[PDB]
């Protein structure tokens, strides 16, 4: 189509400003474009996947370039506990003279102090100099040149892959389990055995000497003879000075467990034996499926055969192979669902099992990394259910999926939704009821009347892994158990030392304040699931709109008739669950930060008493820790927290601006623009100029999206400004 | 910093000149009555 958007003839002939807005927000919905075939659709997705891969490696090359050029990595590897890691330098002409010296405190030029943790991660994987970081940024800069050429190349007519190549599920899983997962984990074991573990042992192994320097003194003959215990002979001592040869072992594959005592971080020989065992499992797992060589499973045959003969799942998993293979939205929704779990697991395990050297002593980075990946995991989980809802409108075939496990979810969708409605209401009635009870009795001067449930089930899990403070004496906190005896020969002396040390994050001491907030988190998980499940299961139709699949995924309403139908589309349940996602990740990261800021502050009993009621969260966490932030600038001057105090108010303003698009709706604004169009047509010397697109108000769905994006950006920027300036301002 | 002059050149290009160029080209492209 002429007159942009090229892909949509309907929007191309729109006379208003709606054309440019909707042309942007539909540019990547390639299945909805005019003249789109299925073979062209996969080839455009394949080539734009090469562009997204290049952007990731350009972004990683930029982090490496700016740290090598403008940062203090070589001063940080010399003194890791005293140096602040530099992100990049500041060149801002709007800076005053006192702002220039406020940001160049320990340096020559104004800098930003990095809270991404790339210093602690690059140091752990063996980087020591600025020249090594530069050569890494050049190689990623040329890798993303190759990925940009491959996206161009695989759109040329002789290199465009056929649709059958894109549908080859068995060969893709075989390679992606072996090559992408298992071989890369084997190769990463090759890096940390050859490069990273000598660098922690005070030995430089780079490209100049890695062919002539064996990573073990025995040197690869115990591997081929099967004498694999040679690689675990002498680990580093308990008095090994990290990065030096003093006290250093030679073992390359151990199962020590726990932490290196100086860095309070995982042993690199444990990570190497982890990655090597992960490599073998995935390489084996990539021998399951039937490619060109006759052996292997056919995935259509597995799904067709898995029907329980009791008939409680009706037809089983028949039809699910052709459902997934023909639905990119079901494939994307499965992929975002596992990535959301993998990103939550990343956050929950990186704080507790510290992988990088001196990462746990950087308090602001640990708060930034947990909050980053938990908000990423919230966005991925909402997108998984969103594309699960797009699948039911656009891709679900009710006749191919007849009485299988997919169709029977729609068959009992009222039972699923009303039981999620029960569990959401039960959690909210009693968690909020118990918090208000504890607020009321503490306000009336009687804190001994508080309802404080001890979280004994999770304390039992800590004691089952060896936590001794709850005196439960069950599995690994009991020296008579066969789990303790079989295990004490391997990792358990390192693990029991780590789990019973109260100055790390491995299984933090929990009490009744941790009870009530987990049931608030469970409330937030259940309601956010409820909106998203009702969004997917009612995506095709309800009693209020039985023909809803004819109208698509996103549409404004069905009008004021039949009582009124505002926000009836499945897109609108994504939109309502985004508020519940940010609230849920809000309650999660608030709980992580306040429990850590009282542990790092030396008063962990302040969390144990004040988290039982809401005023403790408002007074002792929000109001108390706001004090370094809001004094980033004041009438008496400013410091380097002044950017976070500005961003804090910047975040409050975007959040509130979102409320305007959220509360005011369209017909107010379209009438207001009509008088503005009149005023321009009747004003001389502005009558010389005219629009070429007729000014209209934003549409109903558009300002829902615009108000949500303002709400979300102001949500993120306010807490990022607060979680960083409170930890940096206190520590 | 090594080439300390380079932020004084590139930040006004990335912050002022390239957004002036790219917003003008997208404005010209969205008003074209042909493709």
């Amino acid at each position: 189509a002429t007159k942009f958007p090229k892909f949509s003839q309907a929007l191309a002939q729109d006379p208003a400003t709606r054309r440019i807005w909707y042309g942007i927000a539909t540019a990547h919905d390639l299945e909805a474009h005019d003249g789109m075939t299925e073979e062209n659709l996969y080839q455009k997705i394949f080539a734009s996947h090469f562009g997204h891969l290049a952007i990731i490696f350009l972004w990683t090359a930029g982090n490496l370039f700016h740290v090598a050029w403008q940062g203090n990595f070589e001063q940080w590897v010399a003194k890791p506990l005293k140096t602040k890691p530099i992100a990049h330098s500041i060149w801002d002409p709007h800076f005053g003279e006192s702002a220039l010296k406020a940001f160049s405190k320990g340096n020559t030029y104004p800098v930003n102090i990095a809270f991404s943790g790339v210093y602690q991660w690059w140091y752990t994987i063996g980087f020591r100099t600025n020249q090594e970081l530069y050569a890494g940024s050049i190689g990623l800069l040329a890798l993303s040149c190759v990925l940009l050429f491959a996206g161009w190349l695989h759109l040329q007519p002789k290199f465009r892959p056929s649709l059958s190549w894109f549908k080859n599920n068995e060969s893709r899983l075989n390679h992606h389990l072996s090559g992408l997962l298992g071989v890369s984990s084997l190769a990463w074991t090759g890096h940390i055995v050859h490069v990273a573990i000598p660098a922690s042992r005070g030995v430089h192994v780079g490209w100049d000497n890695f062919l002539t320097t064996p990573p073990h003194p025995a040197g690869l003959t115990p591997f081929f003879t099967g004498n694999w215990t040679v690689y675990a002979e002498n680990p580093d001592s308990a008095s090994h000075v990290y990065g030096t040869s003093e006290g250093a072992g030679t073992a390359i594959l151990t199962f020590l467990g726990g932490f290196h005592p100086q860095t309070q971080s995982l042993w690199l020989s444990d990570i190497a034996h982890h990655q090597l065992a992960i490599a073998v499992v995935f390489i084996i797992a990539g021998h399951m499926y039937r490619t060109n060589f006759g052996i292997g499973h056919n995935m259509k045959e597995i799904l067709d055969a898995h029907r329980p003969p009791g008939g409680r799942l009706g037809a089983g998993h028949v039809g699910l192979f052709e459902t997934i293979t023909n639905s990119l939205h079901m494939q994307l929704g499965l992929a975002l669902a596992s990535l959301g779990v993998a990103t939550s697991l990343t956050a929950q395990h990186m704080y507790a099992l510290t992988p990088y050297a001196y990462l746990s002593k950087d308090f602001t980075t640990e708060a930034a990394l947990y909050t980053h990946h938990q908000y990423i995991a919230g966005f991925l989980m909402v997108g998984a259910f969103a594309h699960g809802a797009i699948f039911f409108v656009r891709d679900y075939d009710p006749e191919l999926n007849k009485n299988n496990v997919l169709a029977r979810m729609l068959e009992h969708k009222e039972a699923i939704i009303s039981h999620l409605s029960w569990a959401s209401l039960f959690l909210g009635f009693h968690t909020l009821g118990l918090y208000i009870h504890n607020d009321t009795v503490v306000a009336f001067g009687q804190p001994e009347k508080q309802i404080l449930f001890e979280p004994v089930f999770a304390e039992y899990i800590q004691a089952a892994s060896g936590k001794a403070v709850y005196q439960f004496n069950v599995l690994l906190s009991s020296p008579t158990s066969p789990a303790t005896v079989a295990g004490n020969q391997v990792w358990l002396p390192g693990w029991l030392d780590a789990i019973n040390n109260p100055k790390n994050d491995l299984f933090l001491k929990i009490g009744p304040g941790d009870f009530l907030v987990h049931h608030a988190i469970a409330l937030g998980l259940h309601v956010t699931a409820l909106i998203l499940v009702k969004g997917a299961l009612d995506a095709r139709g309800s009693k209020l709109m039985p023909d809803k699949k004819d109208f698509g995924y996103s549409f404004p309403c069905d009008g004021p008739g039949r009582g009124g139908t505002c926000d009836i589309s499945a897109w609108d349940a994504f939109y309502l669950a985004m508020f519940w996602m940010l609230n849920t990740i809000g309650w999660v990261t608030f709980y992580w930060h306040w429990k850590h800021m009282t542990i790092w502050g030396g008063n962990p009993g302040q969390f144990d008493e004040s988290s039982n009621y809401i005023m403790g969260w408002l007074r002792d966490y929000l109001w108390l820790n706001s004090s370094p932030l809001i004094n980033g600038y004041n009438p008496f001057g400013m410091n380097n927290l002044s950017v976070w105090s500005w961003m804090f108010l910047f975040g409050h303003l975007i959040w509130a601006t979102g409320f305007m698009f959220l509360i005011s709706w369209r017909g107010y604004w379209q009438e207001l623009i009509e008088t503005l169009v009149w005023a321009h047509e009747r004003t001389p010397l502005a009558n010389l100029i005219r629009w070429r697109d007729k000014p209209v108000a934003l549409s109903i769905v558009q300002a829902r999206l615009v108000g949500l994006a303002h709400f979300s950006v102001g949500y993120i920027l306010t807490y990022a400004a607060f979680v960083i300036a409170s930890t940096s301002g206190k520590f | 910093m090594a080439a300390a002059f380079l932020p004084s050149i590139l930040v006004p290009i990335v912050g002022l000149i390239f957004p002036a160029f790219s917003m003008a080209l997208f404005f010209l492209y969205i008003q074209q009555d042909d493709i």
Binding site: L58, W69, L141 | -
Partner: peptide, 30 residues
Amino acid sequence: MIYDSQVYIALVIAVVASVLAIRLGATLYN
């Protein structure tokens, strides 16, 4: 210690990556 020429080499490889991105972007647009 990064030198002046090492910054200039990275800018030339970056401006070639800008050409390859425009070539990928023009091919995706067609």
